[model samples]
Target: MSKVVFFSFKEEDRGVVLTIKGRAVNPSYTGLNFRVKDLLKRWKTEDAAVIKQAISKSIAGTSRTIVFVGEKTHTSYWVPHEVQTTLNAGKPVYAIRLKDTNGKIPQCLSENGIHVYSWSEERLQDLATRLEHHHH
Candidate 1:
């Protein structure tokens, strides 16, 4: 059940974070009860500690860490912290812009070294396909 855990601003744009037994859960994660299950399946860590540990593990393993960049994500402290942690850990982190109907990329993503792209069902499928190829 090892998979990628997507991180983004909660309740901002199509992302939800549910806390269950101290763990953050995203039901929309597709096929899983929560996004955290993807990481916890490999490492035995607490929910509070999962974020940091997951970054470290993903970097070490060169796993994929997808960050959805929306209007709120640009200004969110936690999002940047997560990005910084992943980059510092030497992992491949992708910032996909969750543009609303207006279609504008967040400035923070460009300011940082993170590569940003517009998201669509096809784009996400492409990402998943690429990740699946590299996910060793």
Candidate 2:
């Protein structure tokens, strides 16, 4: 199981993130076996600087980050910051989409050549298993 996973996405994608988290709790469908933790939670603030500082701190404490691409994710201010911060710290960032329709990934992710995976139980297992093998 991953020690911590920071979820980065626009505010509009919050519900989708929740849905993934809720689904991950079910052992049969998600098959996560409760490996997903400290994920999909968000803290709101008006100040961009404060939000950036807080996000940087959160990313620092996590083993990895999952960027949930959504409709407006490509235009979001924080998504790039989140990606840059994680990359600057030498942490891996994975991109995924919970929605069925086409959505745009943040530019930072594309610039970094981050591949976006479709949401699936098998993929979730792969992510969890990848973290499980982490020596950090």
Candidate 3:
């Protein structure tokens, strides 16, 4: 069972998402692609709805959502939007703090009681492998 994961974070913390995606997972553990993809940081003049639509569409069929917590992650306007969208769509949402972040977890994540782990690409990747082998 390969996991199509949707990741959310403040744009300022794009590095965390990029680093996670840059690492490769062992496909043999689950015999599926455990690689994760994130929305590229960029400018957008589109309407909020359009952006929401794009985000929603990107998350379609994903089994999990991981949010990155940065210093201002709690203040990122889109962070809650992304988490809410994932939850509303019936997917599980969770998060991990950015490396060396002293920041608090985003309000949405804390309010919903999502777990927050310390940053560890290897740990996460290893979990991805283990998770892919189990039924969602």
Candidate 4:
């Protein structure tokens, strides 16, 4: 089992960053328990200087980063900063779309060519497959 740290905004407003320490904590997706567990178990250190440091540590440990991109994700300063940090570290980042029923892509994300996918069973499976196959 491999771990992937998920970065996204809180539910109330999809623009704030929610930093969940450890791997077994699944906030949005339920089926990622094993993956999360694997990540936590393999984590070298749990110490973090700050909340953001904790997030960066989790991300650095895991090679893959899953960013849930909603309408507000693009506008979020933290999200893009996280993505850029991961990219700068030579890690792979995947952006998953959290669209409403209207099937609209966030304008900011669309303009940047970030990959977006509807939150569906099929989409989750596809993401899992990609994570399994791709590595840094």
Candidate 5:
């Protein structure tokens, strides 16, 4: 079983996503490809339906979802959209606080009682390893 993880975050925190990519689970294991990173950027464009479609398509077959709770991720429209989309599909959604900052979790994640963890290399690896493998 191979897992496809759809990571949701405010575009402003793209650097942190890349940092996690560089330091966390092996890309081979997590399916967190560089292509996906680039593709994620395209989702924040002008067309509302297009953005929602792109996101829904991305998470359609993902095994898990992780929302990065950055300084103002709680204020992000798409972050909540992403989380709610994943939640609607009944997939597990988790949140990681960016560094030691006191950022608030996206309201949907908190309201729905998703787990929030502190940011750390080891913690991410733990989550990655626990994911049911995706054999694609």
Candidate 6:
């Protein structure tokens, strides 16, 4: 899993990210079976600068930003802002589907640059590992 990653998801599907964390707890999910640590806790407030600041603070020491794709994540107030800020800061950003569920991906994600992954621990770990070696 990412050593330190910023999370962007719709509040409506907040539990999904938690679910991902819960799954990673299993030894089978991620190769070695370790808990995934996501930095940058979320804030309930809304504002261009406030949201940007929260992202900046949470993004410390992390190279990639993970966006959790929920039912309305693309339309969420913060997802785009979060992604944009991450990009503006010169880092990698990507997204993962919440589950085998159906949902539209945020345009900003694909347009700006996001590799979409179906829900799976291996893929996440793979990305994290690649990112560990990846710099820029």
Q: Highest TM-score: give the candidate number.
A: 2
Tell me model 2's lDDT, rounded to 2 decimals.
Answer: 0.71
Structural similarity to truth (TM-score) of each candidate = 0.52, 0.76, 0.75, 0.56, 0.76, 0.75
Off by over 4 Å in 1: 1-3, 14-62, 99-108, 129-136
Better of 3 and 4 by TM-score: 3
lDDT on C-alpha atoms for all candidate structures: 0.47, 0.71, 0.69, 0.49, 0.69, 0.70
Per-residue lDDT of candidate 1, residues 1-136 (tens digit): 2554444442345422223211323445442332332322223334635556544554444344566665555544445545667556555567665545332344545657666767564554344335423442
Q: Is candidate 3 or candidate 4 better by lDDT?
A: 3
Error of 4 at 96 (Å): 1.7
Once all C-alphas are superposed, what RMSD does model 4 give against the true structure? 7.9
Q: Which ranges of candidate 4 are over 4 A from the true structure?
A: 10-34, 37-54, 99-112, 131-136
What's model 6's overall lDDT? 0.70
Runs in model 3 with CA error above 4 Å?
Answer: 25-33, 38-51, 126-136
**Tens digit of per-residue lDDT, candidate 2, span 1-136:** 5466667888887777776766666667645543344443445555678667767667777767778777778877778888888888878888887657468767888999988888775785565446433554
**Candidate number with the higher TM-score (1 or 2):** 2
Off by over 4 Å in 2: 25-30, 33-48, 131-136
Off by over 4 Å in 5: 25-39, 42-48, 131-136
Clash counts for all predictions: 0, 0, 0, 0, 6, 0
Model 3 lDDT on a 0 to 1 scale: 0.69
Expressed as tens digits, the lDDT of each residue in 4-87 for candidate 6 is 555678877867677666665666654524334463455677688888776666665566677888677877767888788878
